[PDB]
Amino acid sequence: APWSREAVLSLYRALLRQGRQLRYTDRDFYFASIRREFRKNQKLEDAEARERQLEKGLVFLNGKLGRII
Amino acid sequence: GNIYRTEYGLKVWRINTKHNIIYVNGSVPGHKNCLVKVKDSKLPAYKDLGKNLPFPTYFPDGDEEELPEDLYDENVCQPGAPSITFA
Amino acid sequence: LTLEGIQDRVLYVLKLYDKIDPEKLSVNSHFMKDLGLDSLDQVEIIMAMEDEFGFEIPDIDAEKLMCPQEIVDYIADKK
Amino acid sequence: KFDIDMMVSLLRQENARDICVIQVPPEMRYTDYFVIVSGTSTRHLHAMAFYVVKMYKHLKCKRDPHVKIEGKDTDDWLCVDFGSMVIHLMLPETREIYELEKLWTLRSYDDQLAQIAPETVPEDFI
Amino acid sequence: ERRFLSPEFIPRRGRTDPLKFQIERKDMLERRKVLHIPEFYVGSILRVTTADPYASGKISQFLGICIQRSGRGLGATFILRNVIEGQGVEICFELYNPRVQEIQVVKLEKRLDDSLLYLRDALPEYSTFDVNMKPVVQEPNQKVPVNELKVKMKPKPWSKRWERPNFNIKGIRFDLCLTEQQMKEAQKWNQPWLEFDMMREYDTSKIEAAIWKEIEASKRS
Amino acid sequence: GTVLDHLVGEETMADYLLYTLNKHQRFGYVQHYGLGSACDNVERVLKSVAVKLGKTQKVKVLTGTGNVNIIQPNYPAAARDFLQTFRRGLLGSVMLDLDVLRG
Amino acid sequence: AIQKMTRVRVVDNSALGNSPYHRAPRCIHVYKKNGVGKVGDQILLAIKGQKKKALIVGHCMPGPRMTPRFDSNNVVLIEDNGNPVGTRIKTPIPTSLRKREGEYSKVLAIAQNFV
Ligand SMILES: *P(=O)(O)OCC(C)(C)[C@@H](O)C(=O)NCCC(=O)NCCSC(=O)CCCCCCCCC
Ligand SMILES: [Mg+2]
């Protein structure tokens, strides 16, 4: 249904990498937020919302509009 | 109309020495090409500000140094100055 | 390096996890049926072990890990 | 020097749960550092704001303009706007209601924003 | 060989002493030798980059179609209009304001009318432009292209009665929005004597020569 | 009808009338207007009424480019006709003090 | 610009501001001495049978140079204490609320675009 399940897992692990590499923010809240977001985002079954969310996750990972450190 | 009126509290932003021109702040009474009488401000809040002003007047002939073409203000951005970047 | 050190460090880091129930934590502990874990949870387990023991674990082989026995074997033969 | 490091250090003693800091690029034309902080109570929010503004006034920068506390009558939300850093104190409920982190990370790619139509104009009837 | 003089260099008719014009032109040239002001007309797409005083001096950009060039001297202004997020915006930029970092002519064109103020009442498609559009190359030593676009208007009422002869608008398809009776009624305000009144014409040929001499002397200096 | 309808607004009175009809479970209006089924969306009910009795009004809406005149169903006229029908009593007997009498 | 009995357009995503009849709320009081509302002023609206305070973000009337002029009179709803009723703003708003003195940081934070 999504662009790629491997792509989803790679995006999630890269977000975890960025959270670990971050300095100012809080690991607990960052990890809880991303985990809750993924849990609420999964199981949608339409796959168009999920490909849009994959695109938005790619944009967030790139961080050309705003980066949280 | 057509009566004498006075405006108080107008400052000088720029002076052109070559053309003998004063750049007074704001608007002044009268039409264009009219004669206006200018003197130091009479307001009590601006009294005793003529310590550095020429006294009794400026004498270019006896002056040791030649004045710049345009005397600006500290806040005035000169036309030749680069584009202003704020902080 | 100690092989039992790798083994018990993996066992300890798996015990450190909270959501999963530490009921049958063996080398052949099947995450999908014994613990009911999904891909996100197993990747979370991969991160939880890598943060304190790793720095050379790629996803291309972590996605098919599925067991602490594989964890120990991969760490031992990579080191 | 009064910087983002100073802000986070002053919030650590302030017991600032969930300190989120976002670096705003010059494209967004707003500020440099956007900070969201969750406190335990309105009194905690007021104390944190008072402490940070007191430290800012007492530390340095006699030239730059003073900063006013913004949102005193608002118990749930409070804001302070420094020269280039903006800080928002808000309870977790208010953060959930207005989740700003996704808004300021994804410009126009936010959930709420997607759920809201960009622009619509009513047409005629039959 | 086409040599273009900016409109604000031509003063309005009046009794003002020429010395004021001379000094204002000197300041204009001194500002222009620092900030390059490109040649553009009403209907040309412009991207203006400025600095925001109360946003920590951050650089800002705005793109829009020029619909009006008004003012004189240092006070010259031009209005840029765009449609952003389905919402019309217009900004009246000042040419000689030091806040303006740069001005770029994305697309140089000329329209059938002196002012495009009727774009407010026209359809949003004729004023909606992409913000990130690539500037289009202009051939050197080429006549400025003229755009003969005839926009379509929204149903009346409008902001102003653009059909009346005083406006003298030729970039509107009046035959698609008005009836012949309405056109004939609007014709009642025509003033055929006004165009032939030869005492209200302003002669600028004797002034543009001096303006160009001053500009070239300043550039040489 | 003791007070002036316009001083309160026809839309809210129509909404309250629909609410009371739904609470009393009479549903005279659906069969009177040939409506599909019992509804509680006041705007949809008024649109159906305006379709039924052919009323269209042109109004100005606020868009991002300016003011636009559009033809839409005459909701005020539909609400007024609904209220007049209720007051004449074609929609059945009603009791507006049922809840306060019950307690 | 905006004064009493003047129709305004609600720009945030508030459910109260969402009108199913496409009817526009109109101001009934301006919280200024002279009753004329410019950008950043606070007014009162009679919207959906409710009196709600609102903050004007952009107006059609021309203003100072370099300040954007909008083709519609825009407003955002505010509570009695300052917390905005809506959650986000889609249409761009002027940045001059930063310069102007008032409780604007919440609206600037929930805004998306600037002009
Ligand atoms: P696994 O193989 O068991 O997983 C499969 C699952 C996840 C169960 C799928 O079948 C599924 O249900 N959905 C697939 C993906 C999906 O639903 N949505 C895509 C998520 S994209 C995303 O998360 C966007 C990132 C934005 C970052 C915001 C974080 C804010 C931090 C401040
Ligand atoms: Mg008008």
Side-chain angles (χ1 to χ4, degrees):
Chain A
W3 186 260
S4 295
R5 284 307 312 162
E6 298 84 342
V8 178
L9 272 328
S10 64
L11 279 174
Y12 182 79
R13 73 181 315 278
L15 295 180
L16 264 302
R17 297 286 86 86
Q18 284 295 304
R20 297 197 312 167
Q21 294 286 70
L22 252 45
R23 276 177 36 86
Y24 303 80
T25 65
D26 288 354
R27 324 302 157 202
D28 190 314
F29 186 74
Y30 193 101
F31 302 154
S33 303
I34 58 185
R35 285 174 292 192
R36 176 201 177 278
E37 184 275 342
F38 266 94
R39 291 306 174 188
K40 82 168 184 179
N41 204 160
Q42 60 89 44
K43 193 204 64 58
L44 49 86
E45 199 193 13
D46 226 333
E48 52 241 31
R50 94 176 58 186
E51 66 183 357
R52 291 273 63 85
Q53 276 125 40
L54 282 181
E55 180 61 33
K56 95 173 187 180
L58 258 318
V59 175
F60 176 80
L61 180 70
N62 303 142
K64 315 300 166 52
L65 306 176
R67 185 170 302 278
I68 157 183
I69 295 186
Chain B
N2 202 24
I3 58 177
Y4 283 101
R5 290 300 192 182
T6 313
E7 283 284 4
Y8 312 92
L10 300 184
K11 78 176 301 183
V12 180
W13 289 104
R14 182 155 78 102
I15 293 175
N16 193 336
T17 309
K18 187 180 185 306
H19 297 105
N20 299 325
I21 296 195
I22 314 173
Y23 292 74
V24 297
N25 177 82
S27 57
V28 303
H31 54 79
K32 304 185 184 64
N33 295 82
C34 80
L35 292 174
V36 182
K37 163 182 173 177
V38 194
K39 64 177 302 179
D40 300 7
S41 182
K42 59 167 293 300
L43 307 185
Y46 301 138
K47 186 52 64 188
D48 196 356
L49 268 66
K51 208 279 179 183
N52 305 28
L53 296 176
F55 196 99
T57 182
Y58 177 75
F59 293 93
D61 60 332
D63 200 2
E64 306 183 15
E65 56 89 14
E66 194 262 339
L67 287 176
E69 167 69 11
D70 282 353
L71 300 184
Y72 301 84
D73 192 3
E74 191 270 332
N75 299 317
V76 166
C77 54
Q78 308 178 7
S83 302
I84 52 175
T85 56
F86 300 90
Chain C
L1 297 177
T2 56
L3 204 160
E4 78 276 10
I6 307 172
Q7 291 192 351
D8 64 9
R9 185 176 303 270
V10 170
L11 208 57
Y12 184 78
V13 74
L14 291 194
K15 289 187 62 179
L16 285 180
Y17 202 88
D18 38 0
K19 181 186 177 182
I20 68 178
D21 303 328
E23 180 65 25
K24 192 261 301 177
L25 196 62
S26 302
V27 289
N28 197 18
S29 54
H30 197 264
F31 292 149
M32 286 65 76
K33 65 177 181 178
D34 183 23
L35 294 82
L37 310 193
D38 66 349
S39 33
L40 200 73
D41 209 346
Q42 62 188 94
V43 171
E44 285 177 19
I45 288 295
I46 295 300
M47 265 96 64
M49 56 80 59
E50 183 185 350
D51 68 350
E52 53 81 27
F53 206 57
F55 291 104
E56 60 273 345
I57 313 299
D59 183 80
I60 191 58
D61 283 355
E63 97 286 15
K64 55 179 180 179
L65 173 138
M66 306 306 184
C67 61
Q69 187 168 354
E70 174 81 340
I71 302 182
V72 175
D73 295 325
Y74 187 82
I75 295 173
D77 83 326
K78 188 66 175 186
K79 295 189 306 181
Chain D
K1 200 272 176 185
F2 198 77
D3 56 349
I4 181 61
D5 309 314
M6 181 60 61
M7 260 80 77
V8 61
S9 62
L10 296 169
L11 295 172
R12 288 300 165 79
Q13 308 121 354
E14 262 30 59
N15 188 18
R17 335 187 179 282
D18 312 358
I19 300 177
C20 300
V21 52
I22 306 178
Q23 305 179 210
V24 179
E27 294 82 309
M28 292 307 108
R29 200 192 173 181
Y30 184 30
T31 176
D32 299 358
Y33 292 96
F34 194 88
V35 181
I36 309 102
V37 171
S38 183
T40 173
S41 65
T42 73
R43 318 188 77 263
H44 195 206
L45 269 58
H46 292 63
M48 293 185 289
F50 295 158
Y51 201 73
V52 298
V53 301
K54 166 182 175 55
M55 196 61 59
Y56 165 78
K57 296 159 62 180
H58 180 266
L59 200 66
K60 66 164 181 57
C61 295
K62 58 180 174 302
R63 293 175 44 85
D64 56 357
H66 298 91
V67 179
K68 62 166 187 171
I69 299 286
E70 185 175 359
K72 291 270 283 298
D73 54 353
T74 61
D75 57 328
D76 308 329
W77 203 338
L78 183 59
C79 293
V80 288
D81 171 78
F82 299 101
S84 301
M85 296 72 55
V86 188
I87 306 181
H88 297 238
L89 294 303
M90 41 195 307
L91 307 190
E93 305 84 339
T94 309
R95 296 153 59 94
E96 196 283 331
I97 293 179
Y98 318 109
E99 202 275 353
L100 279 82
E101 299 82 358
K102 294 198 292 294
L103 184 148
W104 279 107
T105 46
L106 298 82
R107 306 302 292 175
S108 65
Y109 290 76
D110 188 287
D111 265 316
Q112 314 200 27
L113 289 178
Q115 190 183 4
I116 296 306
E119 209 287 334
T120 165
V121 167
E123 31 68 276
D124 300 5
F125 175 70
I126 81 177
Chain E
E1 302 187 5
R2 301 192 172 275
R3 195 142 145 273
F4 161 81
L5 182 63
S6 193
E8 67 272 32
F9 281 84
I10 292 175
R12 293 265 188 176
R13 183 158 52 180
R15 307 171 60 179
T16 313
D17 192 67
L19 177 60
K20 187 257 185 179
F21 297 147
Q22 297 173 235
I23 298 193
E24 191 147 315
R25 288 195 303 267
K26 173 174 170 54
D27 286 9
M28 287 156 58
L29 297 174
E30 185 56 37
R31 173 58 188 176
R32 184 160 302 190
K33 67 176 54 183
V34 174
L35 173 58
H36 173 267
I37 303 175
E39 161 179 357
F40 67 100
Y41 305 86
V42 172
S44 309
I45 312 299
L46 274 302
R47 170 181 293 107
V48 178
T49 287
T50 63
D52 199 326
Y54 47 85
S56 72
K58 283 175 177 59
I59 295 306
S60 321
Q61 304 174 11
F62 186 83
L63 176 139
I65 173 176
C66 178
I67 61 178
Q68 171 179 124
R69 292 194 63 177
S70 52
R72 285 301 193 275
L74 290 180
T77 61
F78 61 98
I79 297 185
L80 295 191
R81 172 183 174 85
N82 200 337
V83 185
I84 300 181
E85 312 299 329
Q87 203 281 339
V89 291
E90 305 169 14
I91 306 183
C92 191
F93 300 96
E94 303 191 13
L95 278 168
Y96 297 92
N97 195 21
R99 303 237 304 261
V100 179
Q101 307 293 150
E102 65 91 25
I103 301 180
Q104 164 201 356
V105 183
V106 179
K107 182 177 182 181
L108 173 60
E109 277 283 350
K110 296 185 60 176
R111 296 294 295 263
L112 292 175
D113 297 323
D114 191 11
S115 72
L116 300 183
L117 291 174
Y118 52 90
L119 293 182
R120 290 195 286 262
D121 306 336
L123 295 180
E125 59 160 322
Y126 303 107
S127 59
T128 308
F129 293 92
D130 182 71
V131 55
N132 306 326
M133 60 177 299
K134 181 72 68 65
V136 288
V137 292
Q138 307 305 317
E139 297 176 5
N141 194 25
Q142 173 66 20
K143 178 57 181 181
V144 187
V146 179
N147 196 336
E148 289 80 25
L149 178 57
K150 300 278 192 177
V151 306
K152 276 176 286 300
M153 304 294 298
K154 302 189 295 181
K156 305 200 70 171
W158 303 340
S159 56
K160 295 173 182 176
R161 303 189 182 87
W162 306 111
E163 69 283 5
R164 298 202 171 183
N166 50 6
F167 290 101
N168 199 326
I169 289 184
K170 291 165 290 182
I172 288 182
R173 301 190 64 184
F174 290 106
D175 38 62
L176 260 62
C177 60
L178 303 179
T179 61
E180 193 60 34
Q181 289 71 34
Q182 292 176 353
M183 292 290 292
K184 196 61 60 59
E185 187 269 349
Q187 190 62 24
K188 292 180 175 298
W189 279 260
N190 191 32
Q191 300 184 355
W193 69 90
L194 188 60
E195 45 178 333
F196 292 103
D197 194 0
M198 68 180 61
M199 284 296 299
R200 63 176 61 259
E201 58 187 341
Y202 185 51
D203 197 320
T204 326
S205 298
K206 302 299 298 300
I207 302 182
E208 291 182 359
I211 302 309
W212 279 121
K213 289 176 183 175
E214 182 177 4
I215 291 184
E216 65 199 6
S218 177
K219 207 177 72 175
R220 298 286 69 74
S221 61
Chain F
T2 71
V3 318
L4 269 54
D5 305 335
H6 71 93
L7 287 178
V8 191
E10 299 80 3
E11 294 84 3
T12 181
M13 273 105 57
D15 189 63
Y16 188 32
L17 174 59
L18 182 60
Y19 175 72
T20 47
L21 289 168
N22 294 14
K23 295 293 290 186
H24 291 348
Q25 308 291 331
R26 291 200 173 273
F27 310 109
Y29 65 100
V30 43
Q31 71 229 12
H32 183 275
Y33 289 88
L35 215 149
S37 177
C39 175
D40 210 356
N41 191 24
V42 53
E43 62 93 2
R44 191 180 311 115
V45 175
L46 295 184
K47 188 183 184 67
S48 64
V49 169
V51 169
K52 180 62 182 60
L53 44 83
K55 286 297 187 304
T56 57
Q57 192 80 98
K58 64 107 175 180
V59 299
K60 269 193 170 54
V61 298
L62 299 179
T63 65
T65 323
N67 315 273
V68 179
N69 303 266
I70 65 167
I71 294 90
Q72 71 178 18
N74 201 0
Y75 292 128
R80 198 180 303 106
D81 290 14
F82 201 53
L83 266 298
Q84 291 182 192
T85 308
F86 157 76
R87 288 168 181 175
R88 187 151 54 258
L90 302 173
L91 309 182
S93 303
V94 75
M95 171 68 61
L96 303 186
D97 289 358
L98 179 65
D99 301 330
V100 70
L101 181 58
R102 270 281 288 96
Chain G
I2 278 74
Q3 63 179 14
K4 291 187 180 183
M5 302 194 68
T6 287
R7 287 163 291 190
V8 294
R9 198 177 79 101
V10 189
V11 295
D12 57 0
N13 47 21
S14 58
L16 177 56
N18 168 263
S19 61
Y21 300 103
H22 302 73
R23 171 170 286 267
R26 56 180 51 206
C27 171
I28 59 179
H29 184 280
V30 182
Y31 296 102
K32 199 176 177 180
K33 295 294 193 306
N34 50 331
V36 180
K38 293 302 183 61
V39 175
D41 282 314
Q42 179 182 178
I43 58 182
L44 188 71
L45 309 181
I47 170 174
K48 287 184 170 179
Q50 315 183 26
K51 309 184 201 310
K52 177 66 64 179
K53 296 181 178 178
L55 173 68
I56 169 182
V57 285
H59 52 63
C60 186
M61 184 170 184
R65 309 309 92 77
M66 302 293 186
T67 291
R69 308 197 306 100
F70 299 87
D71 278 3
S72 53
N73 296 319
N74 294 329
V75 76
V76 55
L77 263 57
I78 61 181
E79 284 287 351
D80 200 7
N81 49 15
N83 293 328
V85 181
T87 61
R88 274 88 171 91
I89 287 87
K90 174 79 69 178
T91 170
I93 59 173
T95 167
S96 299
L97 289 83
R98 274 278 295 272
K99 169 181 55 60
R100 198 195 181 279
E101 308 299 325
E103 309 280 321
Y104 302 142
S105 293
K106 287 81 172 173
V107 180
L108 293 168
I110 67 183
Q112 169 199 150
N113 306 305
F114 297 96
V115 160

